[PDB]
Amino acid sequence: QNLKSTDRAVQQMLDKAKREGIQTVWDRYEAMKPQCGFGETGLCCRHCLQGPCRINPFGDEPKVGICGATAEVIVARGLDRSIAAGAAGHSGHAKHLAHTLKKAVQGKAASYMIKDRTKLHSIAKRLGIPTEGQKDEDIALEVAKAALADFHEKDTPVLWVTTVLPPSRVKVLSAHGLIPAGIDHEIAEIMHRTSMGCDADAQNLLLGGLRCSLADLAGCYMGTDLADILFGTPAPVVTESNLGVLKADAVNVAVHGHNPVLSDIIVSVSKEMENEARAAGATGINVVGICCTGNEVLMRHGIPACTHSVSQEMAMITGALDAMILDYQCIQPSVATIAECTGTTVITTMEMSKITGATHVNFAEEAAVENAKQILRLAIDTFKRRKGKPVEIPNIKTKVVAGFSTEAIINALSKLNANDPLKPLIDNVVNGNIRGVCLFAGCNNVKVPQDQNFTTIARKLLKQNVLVVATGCGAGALMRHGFMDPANVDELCGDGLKAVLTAIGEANGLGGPLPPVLHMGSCVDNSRAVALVAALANRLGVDLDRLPVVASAAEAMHEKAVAIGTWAVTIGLPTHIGVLPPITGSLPVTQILTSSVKDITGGYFIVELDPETAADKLLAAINERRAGLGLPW
Amino acid sequence: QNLKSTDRAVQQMLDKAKREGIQTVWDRYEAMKPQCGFGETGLCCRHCLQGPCRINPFGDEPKVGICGATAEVIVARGLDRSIAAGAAGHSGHAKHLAHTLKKAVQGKAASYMIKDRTKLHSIAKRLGIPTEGQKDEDIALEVAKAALADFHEKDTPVLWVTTVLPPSRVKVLSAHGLIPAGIDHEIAEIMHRTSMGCDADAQNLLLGGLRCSLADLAGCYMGTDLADILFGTPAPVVTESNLGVLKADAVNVAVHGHNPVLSDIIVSVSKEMENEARAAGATGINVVGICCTGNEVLMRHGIPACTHSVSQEMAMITGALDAMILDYQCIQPSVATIAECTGTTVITTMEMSKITGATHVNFAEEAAVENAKQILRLAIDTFKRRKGKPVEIPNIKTKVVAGFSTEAIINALSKLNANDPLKPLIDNVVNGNIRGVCLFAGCNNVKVPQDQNFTTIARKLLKQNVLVVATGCGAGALMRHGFMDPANVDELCGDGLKAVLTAIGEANGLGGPLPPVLHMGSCVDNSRAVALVAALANRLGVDLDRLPVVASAAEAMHEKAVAIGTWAVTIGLPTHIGVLPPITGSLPVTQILTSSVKDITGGYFIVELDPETAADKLLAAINERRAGLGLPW
Ligand code: SF4
Ligand code: SF4
Ligand code: FES
Ligand code: FES
Ligand SMILES: [Fe+2]
Ligand SMILES: [Fe+2]
């Protein structure tokens, strides 16, 4: 079982699933081997009804698609569609929040409100929306309207790109035609240009992909911005992670998917339904997180994280998960079938994301509290059904310090330098106590023993004094292995980094260091890392492609992760991916993505499946940037 | 060679390509056999980096995707993405025209203008835009703004759906949640819901596909509307088709792709460059059409059609094609490589559709005449290079009567009944002289001997007194085989249909019948068939699903054709497809699309690869509708 997951709680549940005859994602993967080599290399096209077409990576025919599409066209078109799909997810999330904010301030959804007025005003200023003598509700209406306007063409480009990157970066991108005109406009143009008999030049196709990836960035940044307005900007919080956060004697409710519009309300209503739960024989409702919506409520409310990504089924296998409340994205549809075995009530809530066999309870923002109560009463009923049934919750959890929004990191640093908060961080980059910054992002992937790449790479980087930040299920991996517990600083961190984390933590009152890794939130909250890195660039007067900052999507899975990796490259970062994207069937495309793009954006992909080697390559990238700034390394 | 194409001109050029060692689409198809059975059946998924996943149609594992995606989820998700891709193409075309109209009336593109003021006013009225006391330029600005507004969410749904179908049809669709909210909004929502871990219910997914197909319909209708405003509504015209329209002693220029914004200007500028051409030793510039942009200039200007779809390379093989001027969609990228062999100058013009090895000449609507002259001078130079080179133009052409816009059909009918023009058509449906109506649409496909299904089905239907209309490369097939020459009425048509075509043609002055098949235009001009059928529905006071009207995408290829077939079903038509879409790997999805959808929209797919059987099934569908109206059959 350690060949499947490096998480001991997951291993324990894999043994339980095995002896109970419950098929898991790992079993489904085994049943898929050997996987198709055409698909693995990207040398397959189904873009018209003359297909399917394939190209042998090596040897004899077929060498070309039926319409004449070359390997580099086919590979580039497939990649572009994955970027567009990712952009569609993050920006769909953002759109949902924009409509929620609009309804809130129009009096149509009283369960929602402006919680972070300071954030609202800062965003308005950034967008050029007047605030002086205006009512907050009117400012918010204008911010929501601006968010929606960025989905289509208008007299300005996408402001959630052009107003969040430094002017010099916008200039580089504009010179290459990479600034998106509208989010949904770019998604549609990708689908058009990649359809049969359209774009058939690899460089042209890939430039289109870079532009669409910036539409994805805009959607991420918009989603973080609007969620902070509505639900509060995260600040440091302490909680726990892993399956041991479930409680046999409570009604255990997982929030799973992505959007806090749903989960945030589940959290607050669950508190109000405590004596209902107790009337049912439970101690209360224990809300726990899975995937990014779990990260959202962890960051804002300290809701403990149950599990993440590939291991999500394992929460159900305990026998203790009374409900799994879903919105969209990254939910294995197997959960609907496993629920039949485990007793769990799986509940979908969004019209565009249903799962055959799950109960659907429409969630309307206009009726959010009532809908939440209906959902939570299903969960209480489920608890009652498992009275007297044995459960097997692994007694395995870690302590997690999280909540490191960009605002929170600046505020923490400000305790060392009140009027120049980024300077103490830069000072320690310059003196070598901080070698550079690495963002871990993205998924787990069944092909990689769960968490092995994240923890292997992070350990090497921490020992080398890298400041490590994380989001999504990368943060999930790290938190479940103790990388968010300050008690582990002495073991994990180099002496430089330890000194810095200790100095900040002591100056912020909590008699000890910051944690080894800073949790910056959900996958849309990769945008927070952009805000931090853009602020450093502006403070230093250099573009992002000069900074000693890298990213690693160490165990990537979703199309969303492909989009994020691509915008990380587009904004100027060396960006590791630890699984193979379907590009190796075309050397010219691989060379563009890993080498020639450096001449366009300054960023580049590092494709490396061996995590020790990946760590070495990431350190080399950081140190090259250090040398370019005239720094020792 | 007759096993490849039933077109004798194509056969002749296949012999020339063979003896010259020039690889064709048919050769590339042969080199692809046997094709992947997983892709053919739709049982393959590459929506995340855990894939590729496949499902055996029958037998043992794999039985399910790695995430738990079932065969019916996988099939439905793939189909939905193809619909979204098609919608992205037609609506991208429409968007381009909307921006062109806006520039024209704002004084930014003087090469363009309002040519059809009557059409402009009719569209404005339909959309609810005031015209009384308004300047045409202001009305046009408002129409262009409305077109652009339909791409995104707003306070109304997509007006290029809701204002073009009868209220009772809008009501049916709205009750099922099928009216699109915005064109690009729907495309993006499809990409989201079909990404990993989102929608996983076949019926839900397919309803999403139906709604996205209506976004495609909107794009088609918008494209026809705007092109008519800018370039004129078609009226009956006489021209010729097939490779014999090329002229060895002229500069032969093919317009290929889709958008008249390009081709229309090539036509008018080519006339002005006649003595330049003659100075070069040519008789003039001979503009000829390929694919839909060829159909656009055929319909409006009588520009002869060279060839279509699968056989497009054959125009180059003659040795006489001096230039091929491209915008986007349905262009085999092989043309860039074949041009090296044949001498032809292949020229791309749009930023999102380039082909490695082709010359790119940006075309800006603001500079259209100058850009056109630059392009045409490349073509004249190419002519000069082939002085003294033998060419082989098959001496094979047909006469084509075309230009049957809906307005043109109504006007023709009005010669028999001035104030109730649809009544003579309905009278002859009722008395059985016209059994029903069949629309042929869509592509050729290399899997089917070229044109075999279109001509086989059309011959059977015509003998059975069906009024046959055609668009796109279905019209192309029919015209190249003589179905648009009135001289062939006695041979092809049943006595009822012959009597009707004769009575209309005689009443319209041209001493003989209308042609056997009415050419209604390009693929976006499938929207014209909708306008005709909606007008018949309104005149009879019934919905479209009661009318004896069917469609046949007899040799479908592009994602666009999938989208069109799907909206034909959604608006209420029995819709034949003569190639296998990738759905047969899921019986539940197949049953929805071919049977249960009848209970939702009244329409349904008829999947039938044998064209004699397809004809029988289409006649049975027509006659079932006749019986439902209380008519003899
Ligand atoms: S677009 Fe070209 S390569 Fe793709 S399936 Fe169609 S013929 Fe094959
Ligand atoms: S979305 Fe599911 S079925 Fe598709 S490639 Fe990923 S794991 Fe496989
Ligand atoms: S041939 Fe296997 S992914 Fe298409
Ligand atoms: S296994 Fe062949 S299309 Fe994927
Ligand atoms: Fe996520
Ligand atoms: Fe077309």
Swiss-Prot record, chains A, B:
Reactions mediated catalytically: CO + 2 oxidized [2Fe-2S]-[ferredoxin] + H2O = 2 reduced [2Fe-2S]-[ferredoxin] + CO2 + 2 H(+)
UniProt cofactor(s): [4Fe-4S] cluster; [Ni-4Fe-5S] cluster
Binding site for [4Fe-4S] cluster 1: C36, C44
A GO biological process held by the record: generation of precursor metabolites and energy
Residues reported to bind [Ni-4Fe-5S] cluster: H258, C292, C330, C443, C473, C523
Enzyme superclass (EC): oxidoreductase
EC number in record: 1.2.7.4
Keywords, alphabetical: 4Fe-4S, Cell membrane, Cytoplasm, Iron, Iron-sulfur, Membrane, Metal-binding, Nickel, Oxidoreductase
Entry note: cofactor: Binds 3 [4Fe-4S] clusters per homodimer.
UniProt cross-references to InterPro entries, sorted A to Z: CO_DH_a-bundle, CODH, HCP/CODH, Prismane-like_a/b-sand, Prismane-like_sf
Membrane topology classification: Peripheral membrane protein
Quaternary data: Homodimer.
Family membership noted in the UniProt record: Belongs to the Ni-containing carbon monoxide dehydrogenase family.
Listed PANTHER family: CARBON MONOXIDE DEHYDROGENASE, HYDROXYLAMINE REDUCTASE
Name assigned to this protein: Carbon monoxide dehydrogenase 2
Species of the source: Carboxydothermus hydrogenoformans (strain ATCC BAA-161 / DSM 6008 / Z-2901)
Chain's gene name: cooS2
